[PDB]
């Protein structure tokens, strides 16, 4: 709520001016402070000149940021952001080069200044850049022919200043002309050029692609991927970052139909493998942006798998039915006499049901009922098609070993293939939306375009190998796939980097010995916390949370003298909000400044049904906070400002008296809503109390320790025939 230290002991500077450390007043309109500063250097024209942080920003201090001058923060006078903007612009549309170079580097650097950007965008000096780098070449190109190192530095600084003003958005993204993109094409479509130009130009490429799918379309003629590989090959990492940023923008904005096209394009130009060998498994550091680049590449491949993943292609479609027919021929014809390869409908039913009670299918009239569910549907089919090319040994051996097991140890290859593909895609997040959120790249995927397909074959291979090692069953069908998922977890947690290393990690998993090591670590980590006993504790959770909630219900009933909107000028900053015993009606409103707190009655707003309650937005999220006029609220009430939602048009836009009870009431209204709590008070009390409770359970064992693992179940007499009776 308070303003800053209005009298700040700061240096004031100016080009040519010896700084004077004066105690500047800050509530005064800054125009007059500029006036007195100018007068200090015997200067007039205060609106023609701006003070700024003599520190790094050089941001021309306006009325807005004068709270940011600390004791010792040097202030430097200079031309006003309008005057810097103008000096720039008439230097910018001009032609004398070195002057343009200086002004252009400086427009680059100063573009981020909002205070400057206001008047340089009012000015339209960015179109003056458009002049200096699309006409300014042809005014001069006779000597530019040799100066083109320095003219390239010119146009690159123009690219910088241009985009560094574009990002603020007050200037339109349309200031670049088709001549600007023509120069950018001359960059990207040409060989290695001055690294500033290539850098900032590829940056413009991705930026204008980001501005419009239409800009992306009309640069895709110039932005091509084969010419874009050299940007990766450029040992400068950032050229690789820019080629892959452009690539990811391409796939984001290419249509999914054209996305499969550009995916085959990616596969053939080696992007997966060439980035693996030139970024991941080259020596170049995989910076966070670069690791994200690789994550997005793999997940772009994955969301091109998505179109087949999610969509439920017809299980009874004739083409896919004959392709699973050929899959099942190369799978079954070993024990399936070849008369079923062209078997009749009666014989088709007979063979379905015979080797599908050997495949344990609930429905034995169709293998495609094991493809009738997506994810992935015909994508697991795609996996087996990869197997016909890459893992025919694996496909044949799995299918044959489950081609004779009528029992429930049966490995249902249609159902298992479909569900394993879907669960491992969900593990691998195959098809998720690529975002900057995830920055993990698996070099496993980038040594093989279909490392997902080899993933599924080798994981089903491990499934069958350990399937022998853990008497895996089809009443454990989901359970065996989940044990296989546990193995997939212990493998991917080692972060596989190649097909051989992934195979090594899976061969580690075949329940041979290392499981004792993981459970020995589980031992060492329960030492301090007793994980099975943690199971005991947190299993019987609900009692403690619900008692805390009804406790808070008590507290809501006794409520408080809540605080209102702008409780400034004789308004009830104190007014009671009683929760009714009914716990469906809140009694509140403009209730008087009550010392004892609640006057239990039909308050001014006596009602509040949960039936219209949506949520509570907490802080600036409050609609009253979204007001920026006569209801401005300083961010120190962020923790007191709550807006309880109801009616979709009237909300409880009020202030708490402190923080803890704000958290309390939010918790209580959430319990009313029947959701989680948001008082750390709840965290602390619940953990300490339930931990004590279980610490009040250790009693029957004490002086003797627990069997950590489950002991067995000793046998009974099956009957209930009591040698000593009950009762």
């Amino acid at each position: 709520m308070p303003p800053p230290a209005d009298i700040v002991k700061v240096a004031i500077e100016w080009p040519g001016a010896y700084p004077k450390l004066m105690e500047i007043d800050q509530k005064k309109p800054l125009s007059a402070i500029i006036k007195e500063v100018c007068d200090g250097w015997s200067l007039a024209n205060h609106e023609y000149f701006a003070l700024q942080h003599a520190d790094s920003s050089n941001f021309y201090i306006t009325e807005k940021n004068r709270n940011e001058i600390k004791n010792g923060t040097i202030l430097r006078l200079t031309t006003s952001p309008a005057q810097n903007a103008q000096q720039l612009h008439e230097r910018i549309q001009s032609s004398s080069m070195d002057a343009k170079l200086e002004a252009l580097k400086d427009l680059a650097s100063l573009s981020r200044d909002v205070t400057f950007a206001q008047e340089f965008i009012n000015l339209d000096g960015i179109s003056l850049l458009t002049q200096m780098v699309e006409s300014g070449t042809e005014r001069y190109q006779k000597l530019q022919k040799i100066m083109k190192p320095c003219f390239g530095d010119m146009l690159s600084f123009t690219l910088t200043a241009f985009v560094e003003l574009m990002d603020h958005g007050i200037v339109s993204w349309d200031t670049f002309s088709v001549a600007f993109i023509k120069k950018i094409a001359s960059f990207v479509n040409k060989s290695a050029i001055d690294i500033s130009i290539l850098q900032r130009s590829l940056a413009i490429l991705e930026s204008m692609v980001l501005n419009s799918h239409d800009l992306y379309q009309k640069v895709a003629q110039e932005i091509t991927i084969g010419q874009l590989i050299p940007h990766l090959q450029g040992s400068d990492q950032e050229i690789q970052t820019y080629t892959i940023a452009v690539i990811n923008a391409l796939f984001l904005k290419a249509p999914d139909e054209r996305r499969q096209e550009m995916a085959n394009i990616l596969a053939q130009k080696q992007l997966r493998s060439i980035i693996l060998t030139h970024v991941i498994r080259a020596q170049r550091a995989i910076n966070n942006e670069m690791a994200h680049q690789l994550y997005v590449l793999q997940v772009l491949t994955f969301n091109l798998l998505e179109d087949r993943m999610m969509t439920k292609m017809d299980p009874q479609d004739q083409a896919q039915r004959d392709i699973i027919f050929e899959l099942r021929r190369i799978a079954f014809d070993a024990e399936s006499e070849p008369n079923n390869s062209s078997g009749s409908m009666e014989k088709r039913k007979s063979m379905y049901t015979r080797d599908y009670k050997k495949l344990g299918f609930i429905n034995h009239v169709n293998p495609a009922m094991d493809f009738t569910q997506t994810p992935p549907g015909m994508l697991a089919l795609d996996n087996m098609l990869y197997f016909a090319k890459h893992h025919q040994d694996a496909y044949i051996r799995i299918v044959l070993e489950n081609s004779s097991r009528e029992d429930k140890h049966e490995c249902p290859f249609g159902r298992s293939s479909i569900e394993l593909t879907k669960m491992l895609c969900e593990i691998l997040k195959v098809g998720e939306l690529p975002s900057e959120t995830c920055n993990d790249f698996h070099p496993m995927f980038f040594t093989h375009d279909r490392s997902f397909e080899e993933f599924f074959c080798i994981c089903i291979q491990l499934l069958n190998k350990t399937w022998k090692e853990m008497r895996a069953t089809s009443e454990d069908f989901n359970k065996v796939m989940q044990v296989v998922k546990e193995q997939v977890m212990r493998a991917l947690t080692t972060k596989p980097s190649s097909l051989d290393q992934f195979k090594s990690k899976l061969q580690n998993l075949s329940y041979t010995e290392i499981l004792k090591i993981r459970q020995s670590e589980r031992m060492n980590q329960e030492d301090f916390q007793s994980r099975p006993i943690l199971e005991l504790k947190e299993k019987i959770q609900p009692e403690i949370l619900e008692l805390i909630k009804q406790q808070r219900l008590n507290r809501l009933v006794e409520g408080t003298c809540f605080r209102k909107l702008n409780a400034r000028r004789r308004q009830d900053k104190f007014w009671y909000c009683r929760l009714s015993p009914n716990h469906k009606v809140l009694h509140y409103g403009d209730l008087e400044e009550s010392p004892q707190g609640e006057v239990p009655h039909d308050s001014l707003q006596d009602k509040l049904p949960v039936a219209d309650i949506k949520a509570v937005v907490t802080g600036k999220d409050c609609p009253h906070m979204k007001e920026k006029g006569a209801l401005k609220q300083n961010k120190e009430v962020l923790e007191l400002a709550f807006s309880i939602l109801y009616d979709s048009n009237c909300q409880l836009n009020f202030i708490a008296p402190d923080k803890h009870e704000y958290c309390i009431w939010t918790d209580g209204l959430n319990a009313l809503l029947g959701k989680d709590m948001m008082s750390d008070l709840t965290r602390n009390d619940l953990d300490t109390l339930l931990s004590m409770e279980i610490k009040l359970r250790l009693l029957d064992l004490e002086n003797i320790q627990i069997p950590d693992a489950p002991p067995p179940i000793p046998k009974e007499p099956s009957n209930y025939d009591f040698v000593y009776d009950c009762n």
Partner: protein
Amino acid sequence: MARWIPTKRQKYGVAIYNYNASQDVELSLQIGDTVHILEMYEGWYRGYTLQNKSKKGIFPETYIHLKEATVEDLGQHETVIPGELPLVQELTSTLREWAVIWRKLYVNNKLTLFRQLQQMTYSLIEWRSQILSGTLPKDELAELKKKVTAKIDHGNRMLGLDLVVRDDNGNILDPDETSTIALFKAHEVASKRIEEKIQEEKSILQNLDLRGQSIFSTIHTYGLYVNFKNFVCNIGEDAELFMALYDPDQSTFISENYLIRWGSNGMPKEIEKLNNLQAVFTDLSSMDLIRPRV
């Protein structure tokens, strides 16, 4: 689930970990899920739970961490040391009474006492755990009996609970209705103790010296422990430091001068004491304390 035998060597029906609903009367058993079992089948024990003494639990014998004794620990001597563990089990009952209290303590907000509840609880349970064995010397076990009795009755008077009697060796030997007047005066004594605690908690909650005087009333040998550190001055000559108690009230000396040697170098002439410049001035009797100026 059959072939059950009548026996009393199973009332320590002791759950191990999360049990399962595989059985008619079973669930994710806690640690201390005691079942006072009646039905003895070899591999399985079904018997009346502590929680519900008319409801059985059918729990695997291996899952039963059975201790042959009943809740007592001396009839077959499950007392790691004779003569107390009846006290620890009644302590456990005391604790499960504190259980229902601390449930009924967030319903109101007296939570100051709720804090001190947990802390006295922690002290009691650590005494419990340390006396899981005969870890202390026996006299110290009597001391701990005294202290646990003290804390327990404190909690009880806090909740306005009953009076426990038989300060030591059980809290239970006296209340066995063997006499009357002895029992009456036992109640009388316990009420005395409650009075003492209320008075002291007021007078240690608010005052901080009368407690020290009352404790110094019994014993009267005291010692001012001084660890001297270094005499800040440079001397340039050998020096001798003497440390004794003088009585201006008596215009005379009291104690023998503890000695320190000092080198000429601003340094103790003996360096093995430089860290250990330790004297303890003893013989401080009640009179020594109460003298006006010392």
